[PDB]
From a paper:
They catalyze the O2-dependent breakdown of N-heteroaromatic quinolone-type substrates with concomitant carbon monoxide production. Atypical for oxygenases, these enzymes promote the activation of the triplet ground-state O2 molecule without the aid of metal centers or external organic co-factors. Kinetic measurements indicate that their reaction mechanism relies on a fast initial step, during which the substrates' 3-hydroxyl group is deprotonated by the His-Asp subset of the triad, thus promoting its activation for molecular oxygen attack (step 1), whilst the nucleophile is not essential.
To prevent turnover, we next synthesized the substrate analogue 2-methyl-quinolin-4(1H)-one (MQO). As crystals of HODH251A typically diffract better than those of wild-type HOD we solved the X-ray structure of this variant in complex MQO under normoxic and hyperoxic conditions at the 2.0 Å and 2.1 Å, resolution, respectively. MQO binds in the active site similarly to QND indicating that the lack of the 3OH group does not result in substantial changes. MQO is held in place by a single H-bond between its NH group and the carbonyl oxygen of W36 at 2.8 Å. A water molecule (W1) is present at full occupancy at the R-site underneath the A-ring of MQO 2.8 Å from its molecular plane. It is stabilized by an interaction with the main chain amide of W36 and the side chain of S101 which is observed in double conformation in both molecules present in the a.u. with trans and plus rotamers refining at occupancies of 0.60 and 0.40, respectively.
Author numbering: 3 to 275
């Protein structure tokens, strides 16, 4: 992209997006999920580019040139993200995550505190403990014989029977160059994160300093899913959700306008005390 930079972060060389917009805070920090890069945010960046400083960190072995790296998890993602934020001299940021980027967002909210990271937005992140089908997929991702088969079953779930041109391009073209190294790592970390933390909702409830977090999602579409978000929202003043009605698990791609108004609303709220 026009905005794609690269820096040394401890051992590893990481690419990141930085639009270097010279404007009022907070910074908008878009956090990739596993085994994809800033390319998932190219439509979202367009919505935000003019009115905000937009930062997109790419994880170790993630970017236009995927490469094998030493095993790491979401704690390393936080430190990696914070190291890029120190080098860019960014203080106050609004983290916005996609899917299992959420583990990075919540740990980041903890480690940075409510002053630097006063709110967060989590997009299409499975709020409940893995269901058998998702549990099955992590299995396949972790198996060096069937990891690719694992990715294809997930692609089926994320597209939800839609011929959605932009999302299909993301999955089959922009994730094509990611291998078992990444997809195997993704299965290991996400499985461990649900195992260790219970769920995203347990992790968020467990924060030392609870904060405005909004879950914005299109999937899953079933009533039972909306109710756990609704019940959690009832129990926690700080939690809200928005069902975006988009066709796929990638609203950043297929309803970027809708993603942006929620991001903008949280950005506005931050700018006003
Ligand atoms: C980009 C992306 C989205 C996901 O929901 C996911 C889940 C498991 C493994 C890898 C993954 N990768
Ligand atoms: K279509
Ligand atoms: K609430």
């Amino acid at each position: 992209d026009t905005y794609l930079h690269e820096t040394l972060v401890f051992d590893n060389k990481l690419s990141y997006i930085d639009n270097q917009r010279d404007t009022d805070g907070p910074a908008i920090l878009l956090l990739p999920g596993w085994c994809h890069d800033h390319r998932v945010y190219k439509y979202l960046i367009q919505e935000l580019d003019a009115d905000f400083r937009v930062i997109v960190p790419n994880w170790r072995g993630h970017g236009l040139s995927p490469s094998e790296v030493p095993d790491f998890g979401y704690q390393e993602q936080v430190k990696d993200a914070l190291e890029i934020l120190d080098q860019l001299g960014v203080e106050t940021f609004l983290p916005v995550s996609h899917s299992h980027g959420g583990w990075v967002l919540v740990e980041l909210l903890e480690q940075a505190g409510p002053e630097r990271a006063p709110r967060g937005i989590i997009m299409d992140w499975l709020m409940w403990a893995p269901k058998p089908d998702f549990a099955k997929s992590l299995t396949l991702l972790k198996d060096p014989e069937r990891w690719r088969e694992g990715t294809h079953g997930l692609f089926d779930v994320w597209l939800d029977g839609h011929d959605e041109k932009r999302v299909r391009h993301h999955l089959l073209e922009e994730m094509a160059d990611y291998g078992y190294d990444c997809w195997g790592r993704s299965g290991r970390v996400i499985e461990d994160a649900y195992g260790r933390n219970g769920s995203p909702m347990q992790m968020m409830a467990n924060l030392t300093k609870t904060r405005p977090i909004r879950h914005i999602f299109s999937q899953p579409t079933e009533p039972e899913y909306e109710k756990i978000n609704s019940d959690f929202a009832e129990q926690h003043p700080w939690f809200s959700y928005a069902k975006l009605g988009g066709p796929t698990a990638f609203p950043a791609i297929d309803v970027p306008d809708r993603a942006a108004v929620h991001i903008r609303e949280f950005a506005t709220a931050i700018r006003q005390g």
